[PDB]
């Protein structure tokens, strides 16, 4: 069903200027149903003249990704490593023991990833606070997207690293991100600044519950210990297992200079093809508010991201606020519906 297949968009410069407006557009086009969409920026647009002046950028907390599992079901353990520079990381990534294997087509690289992901644990330069944009880039600036999510900082005064601020991810071959939705089931934006590609898997929001049931079947202890253990970002499930259990999904490869958008309650996972650098943050639309209200959060850990929905319900749903505070707001989410801002185009 292409209504739930990953869509790719090619905006003009005029269309590219207004970020939240374009997100509304792609939802008018049905892009949210896949849970993931690609946006190719116009060729004029550039975010950094050169990436050669960043070799002294420090990666404070590299993680080594140990993976244990079999038959398409794996668990990923992260090992913090001593801080290192982009320069040192690049050298280890482009190194012979951690560089991309030879391959002809993406299908072969994907096969090698799922065949060898438990061997030769890679190093992932993840969750680096910072941005590679220039102060003058006003379009699709991950540091200042200017969506309603900013109410958390502007009105509540709260700052959540990586959620309403940018994060950088330095990948090498075989580094991966496990199946998850975003914190508070928000949107996310991801730009591949440079380097080798990043491959993505996505499950349509309308089928996310199915994935959850599958995962809960395979890790009953983890499910018992936590209400939303997938938020631990440790669970890897291969496409062959998804296909075997009838979970709908799609795949897409993100190339340097390309944006990926993830949508609320869109489960995604993937892996990096080689040495690369990506910048990412979360964002919101009016549609997200109900998702935020209904998100099932991690119960077993302490420093977890929990956003008070009060400010959003007060401002955008005043007529439901009292009801919501009483615990009697029984709104059922329809994952096919576009955000209200898209009415312009429909």
């Amino acid at each position: 069903n292409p209504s739930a297949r990953i869509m790719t968009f090619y905006p003009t410069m005029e269309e590219f200027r207004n970020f939240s407006r374009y997100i509304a557009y792609i939802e008018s086009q049905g892009a949210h149903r896949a849970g993931l969409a690609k946006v190719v920026p116009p060729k004029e647009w550039k975010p950094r003249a050169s990436y050669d002046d960043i070799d002294d950028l420090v990666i404070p907390a590299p993680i080594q990704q140990l993976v244990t599992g079999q038959s398409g079901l794996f668990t990923q353990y992260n090992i913090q490593k001593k801080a290192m520079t982009v320069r040192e990381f690049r050298k280890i990534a482009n190194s012979d023991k951690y560089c991309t294997p030879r391959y002809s087509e993406f299908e072969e690289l994907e096969r090698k990833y799922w065949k060898n992901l438990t061997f030769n644990p890679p190093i992932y330069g993840a969750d680096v606070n910072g941005t590679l944009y220039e102060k003058h880039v006003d379009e699709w600036n991950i540091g200042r997207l200017r969506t309603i999510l900013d109410l958390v900082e502007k009105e509540s005064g709260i700052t959540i690293e990586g959620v309403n601020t940018p994060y950088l991810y330095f990948g090498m071959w075989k580094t991966s991100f496990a199946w998850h939705t975003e914190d508070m089931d928000l949107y996310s934006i991801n730009y591949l600044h440079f380097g080798e590609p990043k491959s993505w898997y996505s499950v349509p929001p309308e089928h996310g519950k199915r994935l959850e049931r599958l995962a809960k079947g395979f890790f009953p202890g983890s499910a018992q210990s936590c209400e939303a253990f997938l938020r631990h970002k440790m669970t890897l499930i291969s496409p062959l297992m998804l296909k075997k259990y009838g979970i709908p999904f799609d795949k897409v490869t993100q190339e340097a200079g390309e944006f990926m958008i993830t949508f609320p309650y869109g489960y995604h996972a993937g892996f990096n093809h080689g040495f690369n650098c990506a910048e990412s943050t979360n964002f919101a639309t009016r549609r997200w508010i109900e998702y935020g209200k209904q998100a099932v959060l991690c119960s077993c850990r302490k420093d977890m991201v929990k956003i008070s929905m009060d400010v959003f319900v007060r401002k955008f749903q005043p007529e439901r606020y009292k009801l919501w505070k009483a615990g009697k707001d029984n709104t059922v989410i329809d994952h096919t519906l576009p955000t209200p801002e898209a009415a312009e185009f429909l």
């Binding site: 992260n78 969750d127 959540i160 690293e161 990586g162 991100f177 496990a178 970002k233 977890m304 991201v305």
Partner: peptide, 6 residues
């Protein structure tokens, strides 16, 4: 607190 790879 913050977003993390876990």
């Amino acid at each position: 607190a913050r977003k993390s790879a876990g």
